[PDB]
Design an enzyme around this catalytic site. Structure first.
Site, short mmCIF file in Angstrom:
data_model
loop_
_atom_site.label_atom_id
_atom_site.label_comp_id
_atom_site.label_asym_id
_atom_site.label_seq_id
_atom_site.Cartn_x
_atom_site.Cartn_y
_atom_site.Cartn_z
N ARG A 109 27.41 -20.45 -43.36
CA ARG A 109 26.62 -20.64 -42.16
C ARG A 109 25.72 -19.47 -41.89
O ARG A 109 26.24 -18.41 -41.58
CB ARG A 109 27.55 -20.98 -40.99
CG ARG A 109 27.10 -22.22 -40.22
CD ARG A 109 27.22 -23.47 -41.12
NE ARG A 109 26.47 -24.49 -40.45
CZ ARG A 109 26.02 -25.62 -40.96
NH1 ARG A 109 26.41 -26.04 -42.14
NH2 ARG A 109 25.17 -26.34 -40.28
N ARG A 110 24.41 -19.69 -41.82
CA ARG A 110 23.40 -18.66 -41.56
C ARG A 110 23.61 -17.97 -40.21
O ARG A 110 23.16 -16.86 -40.03
CB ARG A 110 22.01 -19.27 -41.85
CG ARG A 110 21.71 -19.40 -43.35
CD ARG A 110 22.65 -20.30 -44.16
NE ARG A 110 21.96 -20.80 -45.32
CZ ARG A 110 22.31 -21.83 -46.06
NH1 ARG A 110 23.48 -22.41 -45.94
NH2 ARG A 110 21.50 -22.19 -47.06
N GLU A 151 24.13 -27.97 -50.72
CA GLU A 151 24.81 -26.98 -51.55
C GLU A 151 26.17 -27.49 -52.04
O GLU A 151 26.45 -27.48 -53.23
CB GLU A 151 24.97 -25.66 -50.78
CG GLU A 151 23.62 -24.95 -50.50
CD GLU A 151 23.73 -24.02 -49.27
OE1 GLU A 151 24.75 -23.35 -49.17
OE2 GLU A 151 22.85 -24.00 -48.38
#
Lengths: 645, 645
Positions: free
Chosen positions: A511-512, A584
């Site tokens: 998670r960015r 991803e």
């Protein structure tokens, strides 16, 4: 004829063989399409090629033979035969015609032997008899028929059982308006008579063939007359058939026909039909020179042998007349009172001259020092020959030479002389056969890539290079070990390997917004232990969002998923795979990556697990590491255990 | 004439051929438009060029011939023929005129043979007969007619069947005012008589042609008189036709007309018409020297051969008179009691002199050591010739020479001597043909690129370089393997491979009021980083906003969007593409610019991304750089990384 010319011939032969093999393959691709126009066009190209080959200044015969061999070796010949004799070819007779014309060009002794070995003989004969619809068909028919009649007595006798002689008679009787029909008829008759036993000769004669040969010898066409004179003189060479030819009157035409010609002048007219004349056909004509035979037969034979001597001088193959011992019979005829025959025999002996000192084997590695001496001498380095002898240079040694060796061990001082010498040696290197030693046909490969590259063959071969290894060479290895200092040449072969076709250890997904800490921390920690670890921290490229985000996963062996609080929440109902952690993870699953969730201390799976898309839902069941800051070293050891298995 | 001049001629020929081929192509591009003025202008240029070529000091004839060949090779000649004979050309006869004038220049023996081989002959003849409307048309007509009459007997006889002789008579009878008409008439008559059998000659004479030749020989124009004297003396050279001329005073005019001139003075007068005078036309004139012919005919022939000898001295082709054996007939006439003829024949023999030792083939790789010796001798290096011989140098070796070879193997010690020598060798290298070995016309390519580059041809060719590879060479390969050490020359060919393909580099898009200071700073920082970066502020001029805004984007490779508090805002619901940032971004996407958003320190994408138009919506899923002011230098490094990959 010089050794420079022996080299030039060998060189030309090897060169044009390589070229015409490739061109023949292209034409065979058109044949192998099995479509009418493509077979016709391919065969047309092969026909043009074979004729151009036969018209090539002196290597013509060898080059034709080598291509006839290649046709058998490639099964191209077999394919042509099948695509000629097959009844399905009636769909387009022009396919049969072009196949047949090519087969006609390709009827070498070994190709006729192949036909006999495969028992296609009578099938081809009957199919030639079916080629009757036009003067073109008839000419080709008589040609193929006559070509089959260049095989041994038993084959000719077996083919008499077809009664093709009556078909021949009917063919020339139908279309005497074509001189080429009369030629191929007279040819067929000459061939069969020359290649048949007494019994078969008698059977041929019973078809009124002496009288038909009178007819043929009465035509305006000198080539028909030549063949007709040979045919009747073949008959006349048998005692019991002399009266039958006397009754035909043809012997009365024979000597006058010879008298109004000169063998070398006739050679220039006859050339188109002289192409393909062969040793065993000479061996069978040789008895017609004997004092036991008629003056007519001796005159024909003498004229013929002068003509052949003329052609064999051009080919540089006068040796044949020594090999078959014809020179003795020519001497006998030259001494005989048969003035016409004696003149032609004297002229033939005039053409015979003297032997070559050596015919060099194209397998130059096999050369003795004597061979090298002869070569060096003839290329105009006579004063060094003694030094070559003293230095005991041989075929192998020649191929290794450098200017240093000349400069020092040969003591050969002029750089210019060295340049000159090396040019010849390069020529020779290119020209040489290596099949003596090249198991891999690397030579052939290099020639195909570009002919001059032949020059490098022996070096790389002796370094233990082979056709399979070429893929694997660096420019350094090429340049140095294989001595190909010319970068242009290196580039050429590089293009072959450029055209012969057609790493990350760990990817971190996170998670960015929150996994940023744990994921890059993992990145940095793994960068300690020698892993290539990659993540979308500080790295994005090529404008439209970087598909590296999945390509880097494909290249990765391992896939780490950082799981921080609420990291999976945006994957809920993400059925359209819009979330990049979804893309991803999906990619990781599709490429069967060794997937590891790493659970942050506060992480919890979403309550609505059934809302996680099916393609990635499996992550909720996966084997992972609960990350504890207090035990970072042990957690990382566990991560490494999952990576190493 | 020196070997230096043989070289200079060959050099000039190759040079100007290359040049005039290119210029002819340009003129043919005008012709290929198939538009009246363009065909007229192109043909006018070709005509001017061909005349300038004919006026070229020595190589005129060869250069004309080579261009006549090139016209056939390019099918330019075929196009001219079609665009002359076509009925559509009646839309503008001046098109036909210019095409025809060019064809007139270009009607070499091989070009006339082409016309005959393609059977255009009678079409061209009839169309020439249709060219009658003005004295210009009439002159061109008589020219083309007379040019067709320089093909062999059968062609001339076939053209007599048109009765064009009556058309010729009527043409000069219509326009006696013009010497050029009278010349082309007398030319056509001379040519046809010289190029026809006895029967055709008889047919020509029946058209009162001796009396017309009396008329022509009575005119004040010496060129008309010359042709008229030749024409009648051609007739007089035939036993049965002497009385048909003698019925007229024409033989009585002939010798006095010669007596009041000198062949060399007449050569200078006749020059305009002396251009194109063939060996075959000389071979046909040779019999007029024979003691069997009239004194008049012998006098004309002698004068004429002196005139031709004069021109062939200038052209350096006196060998022709030895080849055709005319020298013997000149000796006979010089010995004869025909004092006037004997004088001219003696003068011709005075011009003849002595042969050259070698005419060097422009294919200098083929030179023997004897050729090199001769060259070296003549370029003034006589004392070395024996050393060249001893060193066994040949054509190929010459082309490889370096000063080291001179220094050592020649023992040419003077650097100055070496410089001098190398200059000549460079000249020769440029001058030489390589088409003997250059399959690809790489020579021609290099010449076209720039003539001096010819110098490199043989080196790169022998290294195995070919026209296809040139694209692919590194400066290293060029410099070292191809020996082009001059970087200027390397630059030249670099320009060629640059232009084998086919400024603002980076465009900045922003919302004006918030990209602003940052957008500006981006320009400044990228200009500091060497990119020619421009912005919306800069590139608006003298017209509509779009029409100056957008054009920058297409020429740019790279497109930065400053993403800011109103960057994407006005794009929302902008389906009509009214917003300038929309027009800019759409253009970037359409032309596949490598587009990179730069996110301001407080930037947010529109959450209602679905309201962004579909054509530009992709921008929310793009590779960008978050601007943080504190890390400006790192941010800009990242921008550079996105730009460079």
């Amino acid at each position: 004829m010089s050794n420079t010319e022996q080299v030039a011939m060998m060189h030309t032969l090897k060169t044009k063989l390589s070229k015409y093999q490739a061109m023949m393959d292209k034409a065979f691709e058109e044949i192998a399409k099995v479509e009418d126009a493509n077979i016709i066009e391919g065969c047309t190209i092969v026909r043009k090629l074979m004729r151009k080959v036969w018209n090539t200044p002196k290597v013509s015969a060898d080059l034709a033979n080598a291509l006839c061999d290649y046709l058998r070796d490639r099964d191209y010949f077999d394919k042509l035969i099948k695509m000629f004799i097959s009844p399905n070819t009636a769909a387009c007779d022009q396919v049969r015609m072009e196949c047949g014309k090519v087969l006609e060009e390709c009827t070498s002794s070994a190709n006729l032997e192949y036909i006999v070995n495969k028992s296609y003989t009578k099938k081809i004969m009957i199919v030639a008899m079916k080629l009757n619809k036009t003067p073109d068909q008839q000419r080709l028919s008589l040609s193929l028929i006559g070509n089959l009649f260049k095989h041994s007595n038993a084959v000719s006798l077996s083919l008499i059982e077809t009664d093709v002689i009556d078909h021949i008679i009917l063919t020339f009787k139908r279309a005497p308006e074509c001189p080429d029909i009369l030629r191929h008829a007279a040819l067929a008759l000459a061939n069969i008579l020359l290649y048949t036993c007494f019994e078969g000769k008698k059977k041929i004669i019973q078809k009124k063939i002496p009288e038909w040969l009178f007819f043929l010898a009465s035509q305006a066409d000198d080539v028909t007359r030549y063949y007709a004179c040979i045919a009747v003189c073949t008959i006349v060479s048998v005692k019991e058939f002399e009266p039958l030819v006397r009754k035909s009157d043809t012997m009365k035409l024979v000597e006058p026909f010879l008298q109004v010609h000169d063998p070398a002048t006739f050679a220039r007219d006859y050339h188109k039909y002289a192409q393909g004349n062969t040793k065993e056909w000479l061996e069978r004509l040789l008895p017609m020179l004997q004092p036991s035979r008629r003056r007519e037969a001796r005159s024909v034979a003498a004229f013929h042998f002068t003509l052949e001597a003329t052609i064999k001088k051009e080919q540089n193959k006068l040796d044949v007349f020594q090999e078959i011992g014809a020179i003795q019979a020519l001497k006998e005829v030259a001494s005989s009172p048969d003035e016409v025959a004696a003149k032609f025999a004297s002229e033939a002996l005039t053409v015979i001259g003297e032997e070559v000192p050596y015919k060099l084997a194209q397998q130059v590695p096999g050369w003795t020092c004597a061979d090298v001496q002869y070569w060096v001498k003839k290329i105009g380095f006579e004063e060094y020959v003694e030094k070559f002898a003293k230095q005991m240079v041989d075929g192998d040694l020649l191929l290794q030479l450098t200017e240093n060796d000349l400069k020092h061990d040969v003591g050969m001082i002029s750089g210019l002389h060295r340049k000159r010498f090396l040019r010849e040696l390069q020529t020779l290197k290119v020209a040489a056969d290596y099949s003596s030693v090249d198991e891999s046909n690397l030579d052939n490969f290099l020639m195909g890539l570009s002919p001059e590259l032949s020059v490098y063959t022996y070096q790389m071969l002796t370094n233990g290079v082979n056709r399979s290894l070429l893929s694997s060479l660096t420019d350094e290895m090429m340049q140095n070990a294989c001595g190909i200092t010319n970068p242009i040449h290196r580039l050429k072969l590089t293009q072959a390997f450029e055209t012969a076709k057609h790493q990350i250890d760990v990817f971190i997904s996170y998670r960015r917004s929150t996994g940023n800490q744990l994921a890059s921390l993992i990145k940095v920690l793994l960068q300690l232990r020698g892993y290539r670890v990659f993540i979308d921290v500080d790295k994005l490229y090529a404008g439209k969002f970087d598909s590296s985000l999945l390509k880097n996963i494909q290249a990765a062996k391992h896939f780490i998923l950082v799981l921080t609080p609420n990291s999976l929440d945006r994957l809920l109902n993400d059925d359209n795979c819009e979330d990049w952690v979804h893309k991803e993870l999906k990619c990781a699953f599709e490429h069967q990556k060794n997937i590891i969730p790493i659970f942050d201390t506060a992480f919890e799976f979403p309550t609505k697990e059934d809302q996680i898309p099916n393609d990635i839902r499996m992550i909720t069941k996966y084997n992972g590491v609960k990350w504890v800051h207090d035990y970072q070293d042990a957690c990382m050891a566990k991560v490494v255990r999952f990576i190493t298995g």
